[PDB]
Amino acid sequence: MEDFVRQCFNPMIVELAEKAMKEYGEDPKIETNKFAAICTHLEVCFMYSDGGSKHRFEIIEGRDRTMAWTVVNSICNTTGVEKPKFLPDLYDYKENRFIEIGVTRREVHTYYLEKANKIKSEETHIHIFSFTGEEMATKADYTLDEESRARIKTRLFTIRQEMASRGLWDSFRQSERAAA
Numbered sequence: 060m061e062d063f064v065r066q067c068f069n070p071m072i073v074e075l076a077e078k079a080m081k082e083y084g085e086d087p088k089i090e091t092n093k094f095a096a097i098c099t100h101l102e103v104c105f106m107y108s109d110g111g112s113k114h115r116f117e118i119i120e121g122r123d124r125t126m127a128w129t130v131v132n133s134i135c136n137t138t139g140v141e142k143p144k145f146l147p148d149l150y151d152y153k154e155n156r157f158i159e160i161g162v163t164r165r166e167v168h169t170y171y172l173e174k175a176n177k178i179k180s181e182e183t184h185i186h187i188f189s190f191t192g193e194e195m196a197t198k199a200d201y202t203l204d205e206e207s208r209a210r211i212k213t214r215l216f217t218i219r220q221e222m223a224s225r226g227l228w229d230s231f232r233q234s235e236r237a238a239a
């Protein structure tokens with residue numbers, strides 16, 4: 060699985076995933092499922108940010124924590140938007156809300172509720188993707204056009220197929236359950 064990750068995602072994503080794990084005392088070489096998941100989540104965030112008009116989104120995820128908070132503070136102090144308790148993934152300058160992006164190997168609505176009760180915001184938009192083509196967003200407002208969401212869904216299903224073809228998929232699906 061370690062090698063699958065490094066040949067599946069680009070080096071920039073992999074490098075960012077390693078940092079993220081190390082700061083949490085996780086080892087990519089051992090917790091290889093978490094490594095895949097972080098890479099996947101990062102890839103979706105970047106695809107999502109690319110789905111809008113050029114200036115639309117502030118990317119928060121994949122930054123150093125401290126600079127992530129600084130940027131969040133700047134957005135809040137300048138839009139008047141409520142400061143979130145937890146670091147979100149993006150800020151949408153068009154819709155004027157933060158976005159939390161989730162990617163789950165379980166049902167989309169289960170994950171959606173866990174994420175919603177954790178953040179406790181009537182402001183932060185939530186948008187979940189599955190490895191099966193399902194999506195769920197706050198107030199059925201999916202933010203992006205169909206084309207952009209579809210590309211992401213396709214990519215996720217390719218990742219699943221690539222994993223399955225190597226026999227890594229069961230273990231990767233089970234692992235999110237054994238975590239929760």
Ligand SMILES: O=C1Cc2ccccc2C(=O)N1O
Nearest residue numbers: 100120146147148160161162
């Ligand atoms: O920043 C985080 C941290 C995290 C931790 C564990 C599971 C999902 C996430 C997640 O989706 N984001 O965005």
Ligand SMILES: [Mn+2]
Nearest residue numbers: 120146147148
């Ligand atoms: Mn995040």
Ligand SMILES: [Mn+2]
Nearest residue numbers: 148159160161
């Ligand atoms: Mn997220």
